[PDB]
Write an enzyme that holds these catalytic residues in place. Structure first.
Site, PDB file in Angstrom:
ATOM      1  CE1 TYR A  55      -4.451  -1.159   0.252  1.00 39.79           C
ATOM      2  CE2 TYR A  55      -4.293   1.014   0.342  1.00 39.79           C
ATOM      3  CZ  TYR A  55      -5.106  -0.152   0.117  1.00 39.79           C
ATOM      4  OH  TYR A  55      -6.555  -0.010  -0.264  1.00 39.79           O
ATOM      5  CB  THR A 236      -4.383   1.776 -23.148  1.00 38.17           C
ATOM      6  OG1 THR A 236      -4.143   1.646 -24.467  1.00 38.17           O
ATOM      7  CG2 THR A 236      -5.740   2.425 -22.801  1.00 38.17           C
ATOM      8  CE  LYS A 239      -6.991  -0.009 -25.941  1.00 42.28           C
ATOM      9  NZ  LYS A 239      -8.603   0.724 -25.941  1.00 42.28           N
ATOM     10  NE  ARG A 245      -7.047  -6.365 -20.436  1.00 40.31           N
ATOM     11  CZ  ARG A 245      -7.808  -5.408 -21.282  1.00 40.31           C
ATOM     12  NH1 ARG A 245      -7.985  -4.155 -20.747  1.00 40.31           N
ATOM     13  NH2 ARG A 245      -8.415  -5.874 -22.227  1.00 40.31           N
TER      14      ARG A 245
END
Lengths: 463, 462
Positions: A55, A236, A239, A245
Site C-alpha cells: 500500500y 493505455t 493496446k 493493463r
C-alpha cells in the site's frame, strides 16, 4: 498449515483448467481486434509479483505510509522509462503512472482540469470515438463523462470518412468547450493534431490526446507524435505498447510563456492538478505490480526490436487493406495509414453482425463497426481488423494476405446463409442448426487453427 | 525476440527491484491493517494470459466475442464471491469488474445518486476513507466531495465509538440519500442494525464498505453487514488476502409486495450498479485480476481461512492485552477486530515520531489521529494490524514478542524527543547521531533475524 506458497495447478485446479483453455484459444485463434495484443512474459512475471502486497498510497517521497524505499525506485523508474519511450524532456514533461486503466486515466484529467458540468468535445462514438470522450443517447446519458460533465460530439465527414476539422472549428466557437479530445477507437487515418491545437488555441481550450491505439506506433516514431501539438496525453499501456493493463497521463511543466508586457515567466499548472485528481481524489491504493509490468513494457518500447515490430504492424495493415481492396471490399477512408483497416460490408451485401458471428465460429475474433450512412444502428454495416495482435506472433505480408482468404471464405458463408434466412437471430440459429453450413464452417475452422498454432505466442506456455 | 524471455534475463534492472522488495517484505514486521501477503495461487492467475483479452461488457453480453472462456471465469468469480459471503443468489448479486476498492464505491454513488446528492460517512480523522467523502477548510479533496455533497458523522470522543445518537440527529437535518457503514481506523464493530434504522427513517440507502473486515465477515468470526445493508463494497486485498481488485454486492428479486396496491416491488440496484461500472466509468475489465480474486474467494470458503481469521482476532487481542500491560492506552478501550488504535500522548510521544523510528527498525506501522487530537502533521497515536503477520503463521506468543520490539522502538523515540525540538529535527537526529544510529541498527538486526524465520506467501524470488 497452508503456507500460501502452493502452486495454482495443485491449489485451485478448477481455475488452472480455465487458464489453459483461454491460453489454447489465444494460440489456435486469429486475433483481429485493434485493441488486443499478446503481452511479454517479462511483464507478466512483474504483474504476478510481491508488489501486489504494498500500500504505497501517495507519490514517491510523499507516501501516506513508509517502508516504500523499493517501490519509490520502481514508480520513479517507470516515469523515466515512460518519458524515454515517448522521447520527452523531463524539464518540459512529466507523467503519472498510477492510473488503474485507460478509462480512469481520462476521468483523472477531466477532474484535474475541468469543473463539474464544464464542456468537453470528442469524436462521436459511432464515428469512432470512445465512451470516455463522452456519449449520450436521446433518452439517457451513458458515459460517466456525460454525467459529471457536458459533452458535445464532433463528427466525421460521411464522404471522405475523415474528422471534419472544418465543422469542429464551426461548432467549438458556439459550444465554447474547455477541453477537446484527439483520439479514436475506429479511425484508419491519422489525426491533424496541428489543426486540433489551432481550434483549441482559438476557443481558449485544452487539447487532450488519448493515443490509446497509436501509443505503440507513436513510441517507435512510425507515426507523427501528438506530443508536438498536445499538452495533455492519456494512453493505455496495453493496446499497441503490448504491456500490462494500466494507463498513463503525460503533462507539461516548467515555463509556458514569459509575457513580454510584464516580463515575468508563466508556469504550467498541470502537474499538481493532474496528480491530485489521480490521488487523493479519484483513485486510492496504487497497483505497484502493474506499474512494474508497465516499466518492463516501456523498456521494450525503447529497444530497436519494438521499432521493427511497429514498422511491420503498419505494413501488415497495408498488406491486409490492399488484399481486401483486391477482393472487391470497400475500406472506409479508402485505405489505412496506421494499424486498423475499417471495412465496409454494405457494398458486398452484408453487415458487421453477420460477418462478426461467422468469423468468430472459425476462430477469427474481429468486431463489427458503424460505417458512414449505415441505416440500422442495431446492425452496423462494417468490420474493424487489427494487425498488432498477430504481428506480435511474427506475421508478415504473406501471412496477413492468407488471413484475408480465410476471412473472405467466412464472408461468402455469411452471404450464402443471409439469402437462406430473414433477420439476424435466424442467421445466428441457421449457423448452429444447419448440417451443410456447420461442416463447411468446421472445415474452415480446422484450417485456420492449424494455420495459427504454427506461429509463436509471447508470455508463458501453460498460462 | 519471442516475448517469452524471462524478466530475470530480459530486464535485470527491474528483476533486482523485485528481489529487494521481496527481501524488505520478508525481513520486515508488516503492521498495516490493509497490508496482507497474497497467495502464490492468486499471483499465478494475476500474471497470466488473461491480461491479453478485452471482455468489454458482461457474461453473455460482451461488446466483442471470443470470450467463451473468460465468461466462465467472470461467472465463476461471482458464484465464488456469493458463496464466500454465504449469500442466496435469489436475493443477492455481485459485480466483480471494479479495478480496485476506490472505483467500486464511485460506481455505487454514480449508479444510485444524482450529481450533488447528499452522502454521509465516518469523518477521515475519525477513521473513515477518502472515498466516503472529505473536504478541507479551503477546498474539496475527495472526488466524492466534488461530484456529490458529503457531510461527515463523527466518533464520540469519550467512548471512541461511532456516535449513532448524533448520526440520527444530523441525518434528519442533512437529509442524506446514502449513508456509508465502513472504516479504515476503527477497532470495534459497526452497529449496522442501528445505521439501517437511521437510513430507513431518513429514506436513505445503506452502503457497507467492509474493506478491512471482508476476510473476517467471510469466515463468520464477526457480524455480517449483509444482514442490515443492501449495498456492500469491498476490496479483495485486505483481509481477503487476494489480488488488488474490488466487488459490489447488491440486492435483487422482490423487495416488498405492498399490501395497499397488492403488486410486488422490485430491487432496482442490479441494472444501475452494473451500468455505472460499464459502460459508464470503467472500460476493459482486468480478467487477470478477476481470476486471481476467484482463486482468493475459493480459499476464503475453506475451513483453513476460518482458523486464519479466528487467529487474526486473537493476535489483535494478544497485541492489545500486551500493550495495555506496558502502560500503553488503546482508543475504544480494546479491539473486537484486527486493528488496535494506540494512543501515544499518555506515554509522551506522537504518531509521526513512533512511525519513523519503527520504520527504521523494519516495522511498518502508520500514525493515527486519536479522537480530539488536532496536530495534523504530528497526530498522537498509531494503528497496528494483525492480518499481515498472521498470514506468516504468527501466534499470541509471537505478537507479544512483536510488542517488545515496538516498546524498545518507542523508548528510543522518547529518548530522542528530549534531545531535539521540532519533528523535522527528530527525523534528522535518528540518521545523524552515532549513539542513536547503532542502537537502531542493533534493534533492526534482531527484528529482521526474528522476521526472516517465519514463512512468506507467494514466490521465493519475485
Amino acid at each position: 498449515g497452508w503456507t500460501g506458497q502452493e502452486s495454482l495447478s495443485d491449489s485451485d485446479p478448477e481455475m488452472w483448467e480455465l487458464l489453459q483453455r483461454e491460453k489454447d484459444r489465444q494460440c489456435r485463434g486469429l486475433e483481429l481486434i485493434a485493441s488486443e495484443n499478446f503481452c511479454s512474459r517479462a511483464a507478466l512475471e512483474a504483474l504476478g509479483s510481491c508488489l501486489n502486497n504494498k500500500y504505497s498510497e501517495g507519490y514517491p517521497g510523499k507516501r501516506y505510509y513508509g517502508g516504500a524505499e523499493v517501490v519509490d525506485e520502481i514508480e520513479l523508474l517507470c516515469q523515466r522509462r515512460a518519458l524515454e519511450a515517448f522521447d520527452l524532456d523531463p524539464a518540459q514533461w512529466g507523467v503519472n503512472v498510477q492510473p488503474y486503466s485507460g478509462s480512469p486515466a481520462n476521468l483523472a484529467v477531466y477532474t484535474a482540469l475541468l469543473q463539474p458540468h464544464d464542456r468537453i468535445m470528442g469524436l462521436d462514438l459511432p464515428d469512432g470515438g470512445h465512451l470516455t470522450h463522452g456519449y449520450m443517447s436521446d433518452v439517457k446519458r451513458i458515459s460517466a463523462t456525460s454525467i459529471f460533465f457536458e459533452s458535445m460530439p464532433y463528427k466525421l465527414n460521411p464522404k471522405t470518412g475523415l474528422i471534419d476539422y472544418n465543422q469542429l472549428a464551426l461548432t467549438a466557437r458556439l459550444f465554447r468547450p474547455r477541453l477537446i479530445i484527439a483520439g479514436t477507437s475506429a479511425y484508419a487515418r491519422l489525426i491533424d493534431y496541428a489543426r486540433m491545437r489551432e481550434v483549441c488555441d482559438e476557443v481558449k481550450a485544452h487539447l487532450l490526446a488519448d493515443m490509446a491505439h497509436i501509443s505503440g506506433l507513436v513510441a517507435a516514431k512510425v507515426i507523427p507524435s501528438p506530443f508536438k501539438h498536445a499538452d495533455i496525453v492519456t494512453t493505455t499501456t496495453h493496446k499497441t505498447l503490448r504491456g500490462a493493463r494500466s494507463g498513463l497521463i503525460f503533462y507539461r511543466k516548467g515555463v509556458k510563456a514569459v509575457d513580454p508586457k510584464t516580463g515575468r515567466e508563466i508556469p504550467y499548472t498541470f502537474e499538481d492538478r493532474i496528480n491530485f485528481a489521480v490521488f487523493p481524489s479519484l483513485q486510492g491504493g496504487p497497483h505497484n505490480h502493474a506499474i512494474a509490468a508497465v516499466a518492463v513494457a516501456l523498456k521494450q518500447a525503447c529497444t530497436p526490436m519494438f521499432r521493427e515490430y511497429s514498422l511491420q504492424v503498419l505494413k501488415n495493415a497495408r498488406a491486409m487493406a490492399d488484399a481486401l481492396l483486391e477482393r472487391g471490399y470497400s475500406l472506409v477512408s479508402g485505405g489505412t495509414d496506421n494499424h486498423l483497416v475499417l471495412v465496409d460490408l454494405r457494398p458486398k451485401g452484408l453487415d458487421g453482425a453477420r460477418a462478426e458471428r461467422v468469423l468468430e465460429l472459425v476462430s477469427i475474433t474481429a468486431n463489427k463497426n458503424t460505417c458512414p450512412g449505415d441505416r440500422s444502428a442495431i446492425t452496423p454495416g462494417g468490420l474493424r481488423l487489427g494487425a498488432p495482435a498477430l504481428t506480435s506472433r511474427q506475421f508478415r505480408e504473406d501471412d496477413f494476405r492468407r488471413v484475408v482468404d480465410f476471412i473472405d471464405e467466412g464472408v461468402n458463408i455469411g452471404l450464402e446463409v443471409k439469402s437462406k434466412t430473414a433477420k439476424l437471430q435466424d442467421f445466428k440459429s441457421f449457423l448452429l442448426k444447419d448440417s451443410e453450413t456447420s461442416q463447411r464452417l468446421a472445415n474452415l475452422r480446422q484450417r485456420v487453427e492449424q494455420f495459427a498454432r504454427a506461429f509463436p505466442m509471447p508470455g508463458f506456455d501453460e498460462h
